[PDB]
Amino acid sequence: AGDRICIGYHANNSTTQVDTIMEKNVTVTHAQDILEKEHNGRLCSLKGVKPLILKNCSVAGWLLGNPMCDEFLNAPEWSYIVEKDRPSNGLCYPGTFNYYEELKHLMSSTNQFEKIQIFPRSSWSNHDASSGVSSACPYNGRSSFFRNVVWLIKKNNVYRTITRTYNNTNIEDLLIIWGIHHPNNAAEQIKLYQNPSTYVSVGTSTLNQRSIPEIATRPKVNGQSGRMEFFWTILRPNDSITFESTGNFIAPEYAYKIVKKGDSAIMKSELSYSNCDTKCQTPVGAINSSMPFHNVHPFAIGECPKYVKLKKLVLATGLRNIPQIAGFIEGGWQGMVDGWYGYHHSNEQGSGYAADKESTQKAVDGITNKVNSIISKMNSQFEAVGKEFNNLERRIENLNKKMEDGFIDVWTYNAELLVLMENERTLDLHDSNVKNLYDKVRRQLRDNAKELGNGCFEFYHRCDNKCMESVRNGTYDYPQYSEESRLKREEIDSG
Amino acid sequence: AGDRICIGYHANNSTTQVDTIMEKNVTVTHAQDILEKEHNGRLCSLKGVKPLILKNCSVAGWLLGNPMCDEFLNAPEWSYIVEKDRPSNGLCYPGTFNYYEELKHLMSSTNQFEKIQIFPRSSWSNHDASSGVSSACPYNGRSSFFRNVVWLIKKNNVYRTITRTYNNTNIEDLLIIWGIHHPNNAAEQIKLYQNPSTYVSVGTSTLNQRSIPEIATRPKVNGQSGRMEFFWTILRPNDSITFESTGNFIAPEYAYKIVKKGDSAIMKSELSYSNCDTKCQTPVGAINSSMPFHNVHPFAIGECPKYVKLKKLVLATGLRNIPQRIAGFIEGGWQGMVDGWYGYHHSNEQGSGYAADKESTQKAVDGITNKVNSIISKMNSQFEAVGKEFNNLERRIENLNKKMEDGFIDVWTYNAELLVLMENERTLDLHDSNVKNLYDKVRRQLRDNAKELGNGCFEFYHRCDNKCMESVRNGTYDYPQYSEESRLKREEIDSGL
Amino acid sequence: AGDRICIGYHANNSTTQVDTIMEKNVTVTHAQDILEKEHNGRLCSLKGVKPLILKNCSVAGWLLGNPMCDEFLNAPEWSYIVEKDRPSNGLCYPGTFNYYEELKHLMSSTNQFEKIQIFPRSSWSNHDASSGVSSACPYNGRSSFFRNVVWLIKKNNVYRTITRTYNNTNIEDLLIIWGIHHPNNAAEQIKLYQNPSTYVSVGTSTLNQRSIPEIATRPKVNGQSGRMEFFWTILRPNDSITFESTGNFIAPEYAYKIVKKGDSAIMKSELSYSNCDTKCQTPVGAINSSMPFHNVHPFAIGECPKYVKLKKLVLATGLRNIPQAIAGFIEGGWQGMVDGWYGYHHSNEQGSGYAADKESTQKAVDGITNKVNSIISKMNSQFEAVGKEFNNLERRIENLNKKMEDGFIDVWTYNAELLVLMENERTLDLHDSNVKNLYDKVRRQLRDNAKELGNGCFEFYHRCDNKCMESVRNGTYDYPQYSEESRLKREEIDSG
Numbered sequence A: 001a002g003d004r005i006c007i008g009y010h011a012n013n014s015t016t017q018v019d020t021i022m023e024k025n026v027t028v029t030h031a032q033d034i035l036e037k038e039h040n041g042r043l044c045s046l047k048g049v050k051p052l053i054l055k056n057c058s059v060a061g062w063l064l065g066n067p068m069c070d071e072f073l074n075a076p077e078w079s080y081i082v083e084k085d086r087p088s089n090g091l092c093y094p095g096t097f098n099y100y101e102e103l104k105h106l107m108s109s110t111n112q113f114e115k116i117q118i119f120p121r122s123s124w125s126n127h128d129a130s131s132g133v134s135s136a137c138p139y140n141g142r143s144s145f146f147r148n149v150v151w152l153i154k155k156n157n158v159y160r161t162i163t164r165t166y167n168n169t170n171i172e173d174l175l176i177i178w179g180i181h182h183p184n185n186a187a188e189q190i191k192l193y194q195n196p197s198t199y200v201s202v203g204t205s206t207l208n209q210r211s212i213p214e215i216a217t218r219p220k221v222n223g224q225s226g227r228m229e230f231f232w233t234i235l236r237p238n239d240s241i242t243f244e245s246t247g248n249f250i251a252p253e254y255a256y257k258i259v260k261k262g263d264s265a266i267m268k269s270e271l272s273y274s275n276c277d278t279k280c281q282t283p284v285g286a287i288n289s290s291m292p293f294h295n296v297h298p299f300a301i302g303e304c305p306k307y308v309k310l311k312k313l314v315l316a317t318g319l320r321n322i323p324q325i326a327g328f329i330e331g332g333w334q335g336m337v338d339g340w341y342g343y344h345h346s347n348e349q350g351s352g353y354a355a356d357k358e359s360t361q362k363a364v365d366g367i368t369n370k371v372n373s374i375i376s377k378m379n380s381q382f383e384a385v386g387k388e389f390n391n392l393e394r395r396i397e398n399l400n401k402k403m404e405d406g407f408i409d410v411w412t413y414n415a416e417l418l419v420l421m422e423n424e425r426t427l428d429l430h431d432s433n434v435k436n437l438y439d440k441v442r443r444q445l446r447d448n449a450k451e452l453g454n455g456c457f458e459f460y461h462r463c464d465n466k467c468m469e470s471v472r473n474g475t476y477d478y479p480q481y482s483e484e485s486r487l488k489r490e491e492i493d494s495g
Numbered sequence B: 001a002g003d004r005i006c007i008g009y010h011a012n013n014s015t016t017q018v019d020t021i022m023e024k025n026v027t028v029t030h031a032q033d034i035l036e037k038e039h040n041g042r043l044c045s046l047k048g049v050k051p052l053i054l055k056n057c058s059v060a061g062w063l064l065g066n067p068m069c070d071e072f073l074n075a076p077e078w079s080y081i082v083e084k085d086r087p088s089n090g091l092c093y094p095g096t097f098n099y100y101e102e103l104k105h106l107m108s109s110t111n112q113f114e115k116i117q118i119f120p121r122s123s124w125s126n127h128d129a130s131s132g133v134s135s136a137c138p139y140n141g142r143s144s145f146f147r148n149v150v151w152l153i154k155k156n157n158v159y160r161t162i163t164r165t166y167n168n169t170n171i172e173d174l175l176i177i178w179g180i181h182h183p184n185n186a187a188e189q190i191k192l193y194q195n196p197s198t199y200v201s202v203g204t205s206t207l208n209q210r211s212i213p214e215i216a217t218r219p220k221v222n223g224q225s226g227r228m229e230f231f232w233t234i235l236r237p238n239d240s241i242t243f244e245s246t247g248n249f250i251a252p253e254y255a256y257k258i259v260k261k262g263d264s265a266i267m268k269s270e271l272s273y274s275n276c277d278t279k280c281q282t283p284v285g286a287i288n289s290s291m292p293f294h295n296v297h298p299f300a301i302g303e304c305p306k307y308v309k310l311k312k313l314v315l316a317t318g319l320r321n322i323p324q325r326i327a328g329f330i331e332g333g334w335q336g337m338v339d340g341w342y343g344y345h346h347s348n349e350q351g352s353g354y355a356a357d358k359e360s361t362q363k364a365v366d367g368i369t370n371k372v373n374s375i376i377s378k379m380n381s382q383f384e385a386v387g388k389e390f391n392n393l394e395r396r397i398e399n400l401n402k403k404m405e406d407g408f409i410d411v412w413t414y415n416a417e418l419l420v421l422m423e424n425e426r427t428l429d430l431h432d433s434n435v436k437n438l439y440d441k442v443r444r445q446l447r448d449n450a451k452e453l454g455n456g457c458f459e460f461y462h463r464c465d466n467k468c469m470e471s472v473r474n475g476t477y478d479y480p481q482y483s484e485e486s487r488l489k490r491e492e493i494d495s496g497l
Numbered sequence C: 001a002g003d004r005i006c007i008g009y010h011a012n013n014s015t016t017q018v019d020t021i022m023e024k025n026v027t028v029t030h031a032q033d034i035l036e037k038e039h040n041g042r043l044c045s046l047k048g049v050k051p052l053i054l055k056n057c058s059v060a061g062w063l064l065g066n067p068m069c070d071e072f073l074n075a076p077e078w079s080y081i082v083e084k085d086r087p088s089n090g091l092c093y094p095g096t097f098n099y100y101e102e103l104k105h106l107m108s109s110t111n112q113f114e115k116i117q118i119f120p121r122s123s124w125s126n127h128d129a130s131s132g133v134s135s136a137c138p139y140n141g142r143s144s145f146f147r148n149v150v151w152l153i154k155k156n157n158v159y160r161t162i163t164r165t166y167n168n169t170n171i172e173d174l175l176i177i178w179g180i181h182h183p184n185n186a187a188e189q190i191k192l193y194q195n196p197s198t199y200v201s202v203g204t205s206t207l208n209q210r211s212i213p214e215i216a217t218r219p220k221v222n223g224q225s226g227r228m229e230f231f232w233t234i235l236r237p238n239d240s241i242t243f244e245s246t247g248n249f250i251a252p253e254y255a256y257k258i259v260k261k262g263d264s265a266i267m268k269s270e271l272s273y274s275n276c277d278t279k280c281q282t283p284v285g286a287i288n289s290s291m292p293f294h295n296v297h298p299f300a301i302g303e304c305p306k307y308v309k310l311k312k313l314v315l316a317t318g319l320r321n322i323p324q325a326i327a328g329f330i331e332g333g334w335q336g337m338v339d340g341w342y343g344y345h346h347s348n349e350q351g352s353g354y355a356a357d358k359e360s361t362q363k364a365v366d367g368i369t370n371k372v373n374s375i376i377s378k379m380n381s382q383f384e385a386v387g388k389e390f391n392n393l394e395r396r397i398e399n400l401n402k403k404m405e406d407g408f409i410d411v412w413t414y415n416a417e418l419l420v421l422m423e424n425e426r427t428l429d430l431h432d433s434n435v436k437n438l439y440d441k442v443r444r445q446l447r448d449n450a451k452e453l454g455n456g457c458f459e460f461y462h463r464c465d466n467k468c469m470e471s472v473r474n475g476t477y478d479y480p481q482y483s484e485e486s487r488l489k490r491e492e493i494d495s496g
């Protein structure tokens, strides 16, 4: 009829929820979100270094010096490059650009260009380096031409065969770009370069190529029915390059020196620049976040969290919050805040709550050991930077898309399952911890007290604030109340 | 004995077996196999849409119209394309087909061609459109030729320059195929085309080309020593194509309108179609899609289960089956229980009793079927592999493709296997917990009113008929009611009775 | 007050430490490291078959017969090809080898060449097969040239058109290599081959190609400003190849028969063969492949363990070591107990002594050594990387291939780390459960005839001696037969 002690556990006001492999929407005591899902809608600069936003200039446009990309004629250093989905200013004069995508992929490994001149327009004596302009490349008004290459026209009805060498004495790699003109007619050829059969031969310690003009009738594009095929090579230091040509040569006036290699990318965003700083950016926005995961977009540059195709990823830190003298068989105690598991005693003197400090900090330490482990354990999740492919590279494009989405699916599965399988185990680690300290108080006071069936013990010898601490301490001396209790339960047996 | 209650669990004779991570081959009561292992050996329609059967024809054969191959004159829609692995009827006149494999890949995202005329054979008045036939492409026995292109010959010992344009007035894309002829020797060039230096030249909005013949002396394939190189493009709508040739031109007569882009495939299979239909086609037969997994072939088309390199995959859904060849759950299952996974065996008088904790039984069943659904949910969005062809100088990217597909098939085969193995051990781990929770539920109520035997039953320190039974099942047991009765019970045997 | 039976479990001297998901450095009685971490720094034969050591030669130099490179006249088979990272003898005459990477791939699935003659060097009755030499291909001072091709030159200011056929009347596939010569100017063209307009054409069933020489003026490399481009095809059996050329032709003298196709590889190492043998080799050395996993280097060939980028990976097998008036499992483990994992202790009238529960201890050894093999087993199929090479202009697929080699490595490191951690947890929690379930075997037998002392021991109310102890150990305590004696003494203890 008195002097008791109950085993119980923390409950509270929370209603955050987690999931388990078996049961879903389980309400828990505490729970951490590990998935960031919010991004500012702005293109920011990575680690203090601003991107190169090309507005609607294509990279081809940029590198060739399209007459409408004059903004980026001398572009500074860049963290990343943002091209729009379909840039408007590219090859204004129709034609193609060989190994284009392979060139853009090299850019992702470079951070700064120093454009230097090798063949000054002034050096084209014995040819016409002035009239080579067209209405396909208007400046302001009409008819200009790419700024970084020159279109050589016959002069005084002679196109003397050209031979010109340049020597990278620099210590940095050089990017050189040249082209060849594909005219409409047998007549347009003679009119432009006099000689009917021509060729453009370029030479490197690496690169041996001859090009001959494929001459044909075509639909006009941006006004023109002819086309220019463009070529590029990387000339290493101490290496030299030799051009020889009898016509249709589009020669380079400039080259780009690769002054800073390193991490970079080309992102496909129609957004534009804002004045912020970020450690991780995305086609749709930047991310301030210490979360281990995010779900805003597969592509992301910089030191940043790690993308998952999921809508929620919350981890269970505390108890199933099932709030309800009573004991743990009927629910959790709201009246205890000291810890996760603890006791309630009654006695002659008065009642009170007390946490099992030993078990709860071990819980805390063992739960923190898991969450910190999991988050910053497997850091090698498949992060990426995308790439482009041309109209006859479809199979390897798919190969790439197939693989990229392949690892996306694998890692999200890994994340989802770990969260669900660990939510299941912490939730019944808690369950177990409250059972074990129930057993530690019953193996202490043995037949000195009566199992009630609610999680509570009535005593046969009545003990207070020192023996209550003594049962809480794992210190309770059974032989001291041995024969005191024996007399009461021997009295209880008769009446 | 005087009045007992027992707690025990369902058993039956079901020799279904499951594996777990720790132990193998454990006989359960209930188990859901989830791995389809069978196929029907036929090639079928895909939910009503028939596959395009090329029989003995290669894709190149069909498109160029090799006389041994037939035309799909109704212009059907297909669900997939079946080609023999080594098709007899391809480029009957020897040559090659540039970016053949890229084109074949395009086909896999297309479901319906309609063939149209762009250059009628009756429109080459300036040249010979009839004599360009050959013994390597027979028909009636007579020497014939590809039906979709035209071998133009010098007319009257003259080969006037050819300029023709075609404008895609349609809203559909157009696949156009033309070629060039490579003769044996300088004399053949003159004999067929007069002009001894020639080119074939095409101009679209984004394609630019001027190709010239390569004279070599070659072994006789199919009886000819000259060759034919073929090219294809896609002429986008509102665009135009212009051909310039001064000899050796193999002119397109037709063109194919892509009128359905969709999900399609090129299966390489030797079988032939019969009247069946399926949700899921593989090269060696069709399989049912009732189950989430199959091990029949990694290339399957349609609403398919997910493929895993495994021989068995059985999900434990019930209990262990340890029956007794009386006592409760410490010696194993009762087959006396019909409805209910966890029940009682109340004994009062010399007959019997077998109930079922209906409640904790329908809490296990409502989570085992729940979590099962959740397992099959978690994989679906797995890796599915895709057919793709390569040639003899793309052996690297071919190997990359194959390593990556075997790669992900291995990952998920491991993922699925280890996921069920764990769910099997934890599904049975929950029955042991569930039965031990049934025992303790009664125990917390009865206290010193009943005696524990290490058996799973409680002999009663008083009398309990049917109503007292249902009371302890429903958790509504009045210890302070029989307490007094039970105490005098208990004192008799402690003294000597 | 006496006569005891205590439930306990094993301890020992172990320093060893495993990890779980929520515990780090946990000391266990027994464990098993499963990650190979060292190598011998030698390069070895692969189970009795030696690698092809190219020394300082590229695959090109070896195949074409660069003079500094040696013939493998013995036609040996090989396990794997070893080539340095920047070999020093390649295309001594500067030039290009088309689809070179494609060729090496074929090599990496090829295990034995036999070299055969197809166009004997003496056979060019109307051309110069001897002046074709260069200062860029020095063999012992004087000028020389690739030993397996022949640089055919005009005889007496004449280059009669060339047309030669070879029929493959072997059963194997043949590799045939040929090439073409791009001169510096139009002058040297006529100086070597006279005929100014020229070509080199190759016919097979599956090969049509006529190259024409690209004359430009290039930088000098190993002395030369001309260049030679090389080609290769694979001529199927019963097929013919016929070459037509009016100049600049570099005719093969020899062909290679692929006589053994199979598993091979091209390793990039700088070591040298060491008169040793292994089951698994890596560019840095051979590894002792008897663990299931290693972290030595990603590219490893042969019957190899599965590679993971961990620094440590060790399974749990025995109990958690917590040793230290005898008490049961609640105070920890018994260093006294040796013959098993779980078991009992008696403290009766004859003395004290430990006994193991073999029946339960074995079902635990049975399983745990089972689950071990089952972890080596479901990594039977993991992911092993294969060497592939690419040129600049294939830098996109090169990255694609390395993003995905790295991707699978990372996935499988995750799984291996995560599987060991999680079953370490379940191994220990298993031991927990057995020790508990052992206690209850005794607690449900003895029933009202013993009291539970709350530390894993029982005090019998009756006398027990040796064979009733053996009785409860054996799962057959005759409780009908001592309740009498116990019923007496509980009444004795409840008052007196």
Ligand SMILES: *[C@@H]1O[C@H](CO)[C@@H](O[C@@H]2O[C@H](CO)[C@@H](O)[C@H](O)[C@H]2NC(C)=O)[C@H](O)[C@H]1NC(C)=O
Binding pocket: C055, C056, C088, C272
């Ligand atoms: C490989 O090439 C080198 C240089 O072309 C050869 O010469 C020796 O190379 C080593 C490098 O391992 C140098 O340190 C020595 O000084 C060189 N000479 C001598 C006499 O040792 C080397 O012989 C070639 N072969 C091999 C198998 O390395």
Ligand SMILES: *[C@@H]1O[C@H](CO)[C@@H](O)[C@H](O)[C@H]1NC(C)=O
Binding pocket: A013, A014
């Ligand atoms: C819950 O209780 C806390 C006080 O401990 C209070 O600050 C908070 O606003 C309450 N509301 C919710 C939604 O948790």
Ligand SMILES: *[C@@H]1O[C@H](CO)[C@@H](O)[C@H](O)[C@H]1NC(C)=O
Binding pocket: A024, A025
């Ligand atoms: C689970 O929780 C979410 C959030 O409240 C809710 O939308 C959903 O209906 C819940 N349960 C089920 C079975 O969908």
Ligand SMILES: *[C@@H]1O[C@H](CO)[C@@H](O)[C@H](O)[C@H]1NC(C)=O
Binding pocket: A055, A056, A088
């Ligand atoms: C190109 O960018 C400019 C920048 O002001 C923008 O005004 C324009 O809308 C873009 N082009 C087109 C065709 O919309």
Ligand SMILES: *[C@@H]1O[C@H](CO)[C@@H](O)[C@H](O)[C@H]1NC(C)=O
Binding pocket: A165, A167, A168, A169, A238, A239, A240
């Ligand atoms: C290029 O410069 C290097 C020295 O920097 C020199 O060795 C080489 O001869 C030069 N080449 C030419 C064509 O001037």
Ligand SMILES: *[C@@H]1O[C@H](CO)[C@@H](O)[C@H](O)[C@H]1NC(C)=O
Binding pocket: B017, B024, B025
């Ligand atoms: C497991 O038992 C099945 C009986 O269904 C038998 O076919 C199989 O061989 C056994 N496998 C093992 C590994 O014991």
Ligand SMILES: *[C@@H]1O[C@H](CO)[C@@H](O)[C@H](O)[C@H]1NC(C)=O
Binding pocket: B038, B039, B040, B286, B287, B288
């Ligand atoms: C699919 O199920 C039907 C009955 O629903 C069965 O007759 C048929 O054999 C099954 N298909 C296969 C491939 O086993």
Ligand SMILES: *[C@@H]1O[C@H](CO)[C@@H](O)[C@H](O)[C@H]1NC(C)=O
Binding pocket: B055, B056, B088
């Ligand atoms: C396809 O070729 C095989 C091989 O000769 C032949 O048996 C079969 O009849 C051919 N099919 C048709 C429709 O010609």
Ligand SMILES: *[C@@H]1O[C@H](CO)[C@@H](O)[C@H](O)[C@H]1NC(C)=O
Binding pocket: B165, B167, B168, B238, B239, B240
């Ligand atoms: C197609 O028609 C003619 C070709 O004769 C051409 O002049 C015209 O501009 C084209 N128009 C289109 C493609 O809309």
Ligand SMILES: *[C@@H]1O[C@H](CO)[C@@H](O)[C@H](O)[C@H]1NC(C)=O
Binding pocket: B237, B238
């Ligand atoms: C094609 O051209 C017509 C008229 O020039 C135009 O109305 C139509 O939208 C265009 N469609 C495409 C797909 O180019």
Ligand SMILES: *[C@@H]1O[C@H](CO)[C@@H](O)[C@H](O)[C@H]1NC(C)=O
Binding pocket: C024, C025
């Ligand atoms: C585990 O052992 C290593 C060995 O000294 C030590 O560095 C580490 O701190 C230990 N434990 C933890 C919890 O990190």
Ligand SMILES: *[C@@H]1O[C@H](CO)[C@@H](O)[C@H](O)[C@H]1NC(C)=O
Binding pocket: C038, C039, C040, C287, C288
């Ligand atoms: C290889 O194995 C043997 C025997 O297991 C051992 O003695 C030796 O030290 C090992 N060496 C290396 C380098 O792994």
Ligand SMILES: *[C@@H]1O[C@H](CO)[C@@H](O)[C@H](O)[C@H]1NC(C)=O
Binding pocket: B219, B220, C165, C166, C167, C240
């Ligand atoms: C090589 O084969 C050709 C054609 O395949 C044949 O005519 C001849 O028998 C063979 N040549 C020689 C020289 O045997």
